Design a protein around this nucleic acid. Structure first.
Ligand SMILES: [Zn+2]
Ligand SMILES: [Zn+2]
Ligand SMILES: [Zn+2]
Ligand SMILES: [Zn+2]
Lengths: 195, 198, 197, 197
DNA sequence: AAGGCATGCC
DNA sequence: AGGCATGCCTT
DNA sequence: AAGGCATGCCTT
DNA sequence: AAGGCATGCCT
């Protein structure tokens, strides 16, 4: 099967927010509204903001999961490539083969789905700090979109799911991702190609 | 290391908690504690008084352990140790091994431990009742690298976890505080408290 | 792993030299040799003819071994092998182990060695004297990763070392050449020669 | 004792030239004529030019050595700090303890002096490439001047000696070095400090 | 690149 | 100690 | 197949 | 930082 990518704001009015960081050639992470697509560097901080209109009950969780965007690849599990899965870059919390990690959260939980084989990463939902209007999660993507024998130049979507403590769905959003060496340059290229 | 210790405050059955002197915020005061951040700012090798408060005295053989861990989860599995320079300095107090970040000063019964499973350093003294007239037990800690030390803490913040333990080493109580070991404790304290309010 | 095998040229008693076809320099020529660099430029999995020239014929049972090594000293002790991706590729020729960078095509008497003491890989075939009117023996090698493969040669130059050896594995002669396995052998040879002068 | 730092051109007219790289904040390497001082980043290329009026014999060598500049530190051997000594920054040729390396010269040699324990790096002298008038060596400095447990904010000199094959001196030149994060910034600051208001 | 600031030292 | 010495971040 | 582009990385 | 270049892939 294929996990749903249907936007669902749900009862908490759950939306995603991004930092608008421009298009300098090698900016670490930038987001393109035209494309609803994140462009980021391998292993670097990728902030994603969680915006809600009302606070979810305690025990709420936030899951991220990658799937290939193109229909002919959707059934293939998105994983790190054979080279990077073997690299010495463990943070001591994440599985070597998971593409998406969360950094900065000791309560992070990774899953290898026993039936789908799909990887995901889950953290508990915490409301914004005082004064803040949104909750920021810092993701890292641990292969380039180009990785031979991994994503192998295929676009992926990251699906962000808000879940109750047992995994029932409360909210869903998604964005496309390109992990590459030069996010600003590649953001500009894809955008210009869209004209 | 492959695991991390708890930082969960645990008063336990003796009502265990920590107390800190009120100190300056003068640029380079040798040790100053921020209640807003629950964070100690201090200079390398300078006295850090930490007060132990209990509601009733624990049994003889009770011990007090201090251990350092990285605050950031992405570094938390890594053992906090001295940098290559300071490890090789000739600054022993007579008992402390050269690789240990935290020393206790002024106590003959101090012991330094390397965990053989976790590899983690800690320093442990026997627990003493507060002196006659006093309400708490003051221990004098030192930190033997700056937070900035290259090849050591390397600008990564740490927490010090203080545990009350029985003689076999089971937990009686736990508290913790962040530490920055820096050149200008008063300056840095204020900078960080200012940042809170932004 | 282990120490570096000698790369010293040793023509020996049989006058052992190598020779290479005088190929193209068009962008993506499958295989081209630069006399100036003593360097082959070739594509992944494409035929790389290598000529054996001896002044005098080696005895029955002589064998021809090739083995790759990193050119550079910091890299010399590391075994040249295929990157994790290509090693797990379904590209067997039926005979070569999947980790081996260097294959021989067209030769059912090929053997592949995983050296138990050095961990180094090599591929060896029986020596055959030239046929009739031919002045050399040609072996067709294939290189199964690009020089650039991350997790493998990772942009680090290699040498291939061809040894002539007796039926017992004793050295008879030795030659070597540098290799770059890349997408566009012609372009990259031009570039590299250009940069030399 | 302390090695001599006194400049002399000697019989080959031996002198150093530097590149004039300007003072942008983060320029890799830049040189101050007014200070006879090179400002450079840790581990980056520092080009140093050898100029001679006549060609010394082959077997002629060019050695580089750091000493502390201040008279009270002079007798202390200049070395990397414990942290950088330990880092994984090896080129496979240089000893981990040596501040000064030569990059891009496979003939480099390092010395630990048996009497003084001072470090040095030496390369054969080679004549200018045809159509050029000087020989360039690429030095790397492998600690910052500010490195705690190494130079610890003490200025140093590099002494470049032209030597015959016995190590007899043919020519000497020296210059101050500051290894720092922002050479351009720091050269500016230091030259501004030469001024009277 | 080159603004911004962290952090040692005076 | 405000002012500087000097490192490292990201872009 | 030369020309153009995709895309990682180094330089300053 | 954008420029430049290494180096795979394509039309
Ligand atoms: Zn990868
Ligand atoms: Zn230290
Ligand atoms: Zn490969
Ligand atoms: Zn250093």
């Amino acid at each position: 099967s294929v996990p749903s990518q249907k936007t669902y704001q749900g009862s908490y009015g759950f939306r995603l927010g991004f930092l608008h960081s421009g298009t300098a050639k090698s900016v670490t992470c930038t987001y393109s509204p035209a494309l609803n697509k994140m462009f980021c560097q391998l292993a670097k901080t990728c902030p994603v903001q969680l915006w809600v209109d009302s606070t979810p009950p305690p025990g709420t969780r936030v899951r991220a999961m990658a799937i290939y965007k193109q229909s002919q690849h959707m059934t293939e599990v998105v994983r790190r490539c054979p080279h990077h899965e073997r690299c010495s870059d463990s943070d001591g919390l994440a599985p070597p083969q998971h593409l998406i990690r969360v950094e900065g959260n000791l309560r992070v939980e990774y899953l290898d789905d026993r039936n789908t084989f799909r990887h995901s990463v889950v953290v508990p939902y915490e409301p914004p700090e005082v004064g803040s209007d949104c909750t920021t999660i810092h993701y890292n993507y641990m292969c380039n979109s180009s990785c031979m024998g991994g994503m192998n130049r295929r676009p992926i979507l990251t699906i962000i799911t808000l879940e109750d403590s047992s995994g029932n769905l409360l909210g869903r959003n998604s964005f496309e991702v390109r992990v590459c060496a030069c996010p600003g340059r590649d953001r500009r290229t894809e955008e210009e190609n869209l004209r």
